[model samples]
Target: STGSATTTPIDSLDDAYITPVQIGTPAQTLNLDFDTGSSDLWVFSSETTASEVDGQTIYTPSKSTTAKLLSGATWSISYGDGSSSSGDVYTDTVSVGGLTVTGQAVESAKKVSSSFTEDSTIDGLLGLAFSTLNTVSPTQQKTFFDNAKASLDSPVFTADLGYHAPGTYNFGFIDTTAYTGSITYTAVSTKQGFWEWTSTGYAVGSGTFKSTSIDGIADTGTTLLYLPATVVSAYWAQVSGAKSSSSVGGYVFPCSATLPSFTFGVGSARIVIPGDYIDFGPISTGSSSCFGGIQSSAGIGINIFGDVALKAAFVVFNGATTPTLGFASK
Candidate 1:
């Protein structure tokens, strides 16, 4: 469901690396991931060798003409997916969309795992979520919003995933002309490292049977939309002639009729998820039943609305102007 955004395939070299703002004049060129789930900017550096890096992107400052390392501060981050990385701190000048910022803080990995070294195409991740989830220390943490806010012509930022080349994810201001009308916005929560929300309930087949309300968070870094088992079963029951088949990793289902559309209410906004998302193709065991994009993460406790749901709409993470989340069309 997470369709390709940039017509340009993300290249491992050249565009793979982004310009980061650090202390001094020239911005430092660093490689980062455009992560939507969390709000933090991290990079791998000389301190990290190939052996220590795991399933994460590593940054090579040697390639950049303008890079500076902080003397003593160390940085570490752990994800909900059970992955972790740690490193030193550095400052560098960064550039994006022809705008430049200086003295930007970046992390230089000291220890990395195999998951990171295997990816020849990615260097590091640049978080695009709200700053509420930023994990950086109060004394040292400086998010991309901190630097880009002043330079942007508008106090807005939009992600053009549909057109970004492999390494060309642009930030800054929202292009107002791309949308159909004025964008609706939700106030941001200044708490953690990700954009979270409280789900009022779920709807199926033209908003017909609304289920019990629940609370969850929306994350783009994750690949699937995770919900409670009870909630999933209630929705599945509505699917006419739907049958579960083990061949499809136990999540697949088969039905002859069209499945009903579903929507999850986020406060006043009702985010709609099409029926196709429920009909994800089988997971290769040669099963007639189709795999589902929404799965049961009962043990995980929290609900995660992954990339599949986000791609269906034009969502904006507005951390610059105010602590808020905005939605619009592209």
Candidate 2:
């Protein structure tokens, strides 16, 4: 069986994308971020503190007759940006785009960071990465995708993120009409518990392609594209007004700068990121300086092909015995 859902960016800057999810017996609908970068399906609930609860929706497991406590099971997760959440676990009926998974582990948040409380658009996160990355103690829980894959017609899910419009996420089947040209397949390593793959190389604008391997994860949860310092520096150099600013804490340039497109090689195929995508958005309200979508991943230890790069193509997360990744131009 297959399922499909519509995902929309939370804001104009495409800060985060969210899709509706149904949880519990009566079906408590909430908008969740389908995060490919992490593996913990945690959410705000009746367990969270009153002050901690903001404008986001909460999942009260007590209201669901199908919900059952997973005794002694607890989960804690933190991200690169330092946002964290932890709580106890419950097994309940969960559904996404008509695909239902019974006895799914639903982490009920007890404590959350201020960052999460302020972001009302995201009621929770639905991790799409491998279950190996799950943070639950004693016995790690499987992700929604992991638990549902066995029953699906095909053990795969596809992400088609848009620039400023809504996009589609399809499970179990790949829609050929959703993409253009043949998909370029590449081996994926789950050693790091991520959809990690290596790109052949990258090019700045129309320059010659560099033949070097750049390994990174295809993370839809992240906001920007992070690459090696050298590659990031080279791209910004083409923009006359670009520079690294301490005040902004990242590379920034004039909002009206004529930025060149960036390209990355996946096998023999090349995917181009339009210059407009690189422009990102203004640093602040009425500010002339704009942050770049591509940044240096030097200290981060790993490159991240986040939403900035993923939006340029259609990505397939194949969860087969030998998992592979498929990329196609849209």
Candidate 3:
């Protein structure tokens, strides 16, 4: 079994951040965020100004002997965070962790905002989930996973988030060492672009909010677990020493006290959010402590279960194998 903690360090590229991967011979590097929420591969280009390309690591296509640009089109993408970028299309030889895949579709952005230009470590994002949400026009668009499947040694791509230890997120192969039981899976619905479901209810400490059911989507792109206002309020009400301290942005409770573990029932799966990840961080918000995981996005359409939720279990995205979501013991 893999013993170390898995923490995947995400880099912010332009407005959207991507995980880095080595591409081409002589090894030119490409930054890609493997998003299940979206499908596309894009990078910054030589045409972009050095000032616009500030914090981001831009890949010069001229540097790659195998790079080719798609001349017929221009692509632009905007995120919920209001950050966007516009660029042309191209294809190049790509590789991740030494595994090579040729003729990969890429977007080279010409216009970028100050947010994207500020990040020093991020380059680009690669969407690894299903193609139901792919934005490519003419319907001929193919996802990185669809194109790379032929070159991968394994049919499945596993996301290993060793949170606390050195966490790793890898593709192409499944490390059987991390799983202790048969993977429990949930079928995908055509309606939602992302794999989503209704959370029956949750229990916090001795109190249980059984009256309301929480509905949210699982997103690897997001970093923290966002809960609805009602659920958030009900949860805090149950904690013995938990109070609305101004020190933390939201509800802050004493770190020394042991809080109740919260469990969400997703059909047959009972996922638990541990207390250590829920408590306040070292920094205090006035008298309220800064919570480690919970954040408030009150009216958002759907609640998001991010890396914090994934860290609690062994998650497998079986899009290539089957249109399903699988979970097992970490």
Best candidate (score: lDDT):
2
How many residue pairs clash per model? 40, 0, 28
- Best TM-score among the predictions, by candidate number: 2
Better candidate number, 1 or 3, judged by TM-score: 3
Per-residue lDDT for 1-330 in model 2, tens only?
888999999998888899999999899999999999999898899998889989999999999999999999999998988999999999999999889999899999999999999999999999999899999988899999998999999999999999988998999999999999999999999999999999999999989999899999999999999999999999999999899887887899998898899999999999999988887788989999999999999878889999999999999999999999999999
Candidate 1, 233-329: lDDT as tens digits: 7667777556445444445556354666667765556666677645555445575555666677675777886654554446666655345666554
Question: Candidate 2 local accuracy as lDDT?
Answer: 0.93
Residues 1-330 of candidate 3 have per-residue lDDT tens digits of 111112345522111234557655556665655566666676666877666876566677787788786667666767545666777776787766545567877777788776667655557667665666655544335666677666666555666654554345556656778867667776655476676655667777545447456666667766666788776776776666666545545666665556666666655566676766565344533534435465554756778766666666677776554466677666
The list of candidate 2 runs beyond 4 A from truth reads none
lDDT of 2 at 195: 96
Residue 45 in candidate 1, Cα distance off native in Å:
3.8
Task: Assess candidate 2 and give its TM-score to the true structure.
Answer: 0.98
Candidate 3 yields a Cα-based lDDT of 0.62
lDDT of each: 0.57, 0.93, 0.62
User: Candidate 1, overall lDDT?
Assistant: 0.57
lDDT order, best first, reads: 2, 3, 1
| RMSD (Å) of each candidate, 1 decimal | 5.9, 0.8, 4.6
